[PDB]
């Protein structure tokens, strides 16, 4: 009952602290955001949580991944983190949560994978040490059976992998990734997919790509997650959208498992015949359109969506034009790369190069991020003056 008082108090703080506007349209905190927090406590399997104190640490994680970390700035995230800590202080006593809300805290994450990709998947706290090891290991299994991903792993990127792997764990749950240019999200989602066991799918962009060709792919995509009952991740970028009416079919898939004018009358009946074998196996003796209402529930469980929007252009308009894209999906805003990320990246790319000396080597890897950060500052200093 204390969690339910706590989650309510949190909703009342954020809705007051963050008001919706034409910019930051998403900041509107509806009920269904609160509903996604409690969906994360259900993912928690019993017996794996003996300690009471711990179940709170899971709820705290889940709040940040749910309707935290959808903020344009780092300054908003600082106010949001402060708002929780004080609500966590009042609600929960005899339980310390210092050093998980302080300045320079210890990263906390809850994924299905802890012991690794290979071992059994129980949803619980991952230690920060094994994070670097397991995401690295998980890449090597992807660098086997798939095309070489060629990504550099920095603390913030590993966070983004785990964050997506949560968002695509529950049945109805869908992902929406907001990144500036080369943020990570498109390939990070291809990694996330493989860690979950879901095979990634992406529509092939063509000059002669029609409505009927999309509709044909959506049927085959349903067939993979419907009777065959295989988990299929669906990656969709702004580049992949040539026509606005393609994004219609998508918004229906996010709203509910049922899509209008996807299946014909014959194909629907032909699919119900295949499902009829399954429901007899499940032990629910129904030979009616209840079987079809089971199919779309099974499809929406084994079909997740990872949509990849740029912030600056063609989002505010599409968000206003389709409510599903921003409402139904759990969004995770990508901030710019931190100084700690850039330094790790620069050192990997420059590793093959000589760079003369060993002191020089140390200074040249130091320069790359220092040069990027002060140009980014001057870019905002310039913007203020001349509007460049």
């Amino acid at each position: 009952n204390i969690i339910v008082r706590a989650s309510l108090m949190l909703h009342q703080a954020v809705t007051q602290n963050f008001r919706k506007t034409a910019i930051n349209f998403h900041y509107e905190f509806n009920l269904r955001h609160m509903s996604n927090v409690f969906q994360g406590l259900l993912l928690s399997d019993p017996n794996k949580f003996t300690e009471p104190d711990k179940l709170i640490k899971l709820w705290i994680h889940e709040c940040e991944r749910t309707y935290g970390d959808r903020l344009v700035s780092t300054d908003n995230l600082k106010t949001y983190k402060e708002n929780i800590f004080d609500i966590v202080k009042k609600s929960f006593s005899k339980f310390n949560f210092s050093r998980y809300f302080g300045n320079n805290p210890e990263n906390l994450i809850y994924c299905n994978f802890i012991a690794g990709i290979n071992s059994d998947r129980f949803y619980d706290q991952m230690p920060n040490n094994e994070m670097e090891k397991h995401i690295s290991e998980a890449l090597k299994e992807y660098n086997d059976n798939n095309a070489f991903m060629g990504l550099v792993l920095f603390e913030d990127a590993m966070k983004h992998v785990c964050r997506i792997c949560r968002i695509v764990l529950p049945s109805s749950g869908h992902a929406l990734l907001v990144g500036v240019g080369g943020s990570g999200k498109q390939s990070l989602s291809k990694l996330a997919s493989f860690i979950m066991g879901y095979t990634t799918f992406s529509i092939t962009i063509s000059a002669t790509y029609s409505m009927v060709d999309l509709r044909n792919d959506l049927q085959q995509l349903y067939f993979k997650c419907g009777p065959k009952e295989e988990g299929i991740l669906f990656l969709f970028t702004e580049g992949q959208i040539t026509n606005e009416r393609f994004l219609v079919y998508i918004n229906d898939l996010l709203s509910s498992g049922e899509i209008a004018e996807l299946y014909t009358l014959d194909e629907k009946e032909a699919m119900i015949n295949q499902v009829r074998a399954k429901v007899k196996g499940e032990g629910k003796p129904d030979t009616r359109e209840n079987c079809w209402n089971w199919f779309i529930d099974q499809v929406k469980k084994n079909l997740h969506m990872a949509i990849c929007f740029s912030p600056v252009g063609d989002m505010r308009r599409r968000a206003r034009q389709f409510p599903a894209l921003v409402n139904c999906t759990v969004i995770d805003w990508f901030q710019p790369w931190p100084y700690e990320a850039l330094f790790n990246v620069a050192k990997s790319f420059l590793e093959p190069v000589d760079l003369g000396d060993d002191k020089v080597r140390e200074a040249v890897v130091k320069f790359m991020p220092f040069s990027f950060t002060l140009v980014n500052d001057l870019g905002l200093k310039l913007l203020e003056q001349e509007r460049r």
């Binding site: 606005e244 229906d252 709203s255 509910s256 209008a260 004018e261 409510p323």
Partner: protein, 96 residues
């Protein structure tokens, strides 16, 4: 919920339409969807339901498609619902 649900039911048994306003919260669709299941559970012969979400690119010609998808000639009286029973329609995102 219990108050509002009771009314919408009693309204659909007098063939008087309703309309559900909300700030994208308090489960307008799910309350409505829940009610339509409760009515269908009671009388599966008399009343059937079909939920049609409204996209930004839904015209008159498209809507005619969904109406024509579940209809009959019904031996005179022009278009009639299948089974000779009263089909409930539903409409979501009527605003857009």
């Amino acid at each position: 919920t219990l108050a509002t649900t009771e009314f919408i039911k009693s309204y659909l048994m007098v063939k008087h339409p309703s309309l559900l306003i909300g700030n994208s919260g308090c489960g307008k669709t799910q309350l409505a969807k829940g009610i339509l299941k409760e009515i269908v559970q009671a009388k599966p012969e008399n009343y059937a339901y079909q939920l049609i979400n409204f996209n930004y690119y839904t015209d008159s010609t498209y809507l005619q498609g969904q109406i024509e998808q579940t209809l009959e000639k019904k031996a005179g009286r022009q278009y009639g619902p299948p089974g000779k029973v009263q089909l409930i329609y539903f409409i979501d995102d009527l605003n857009m």
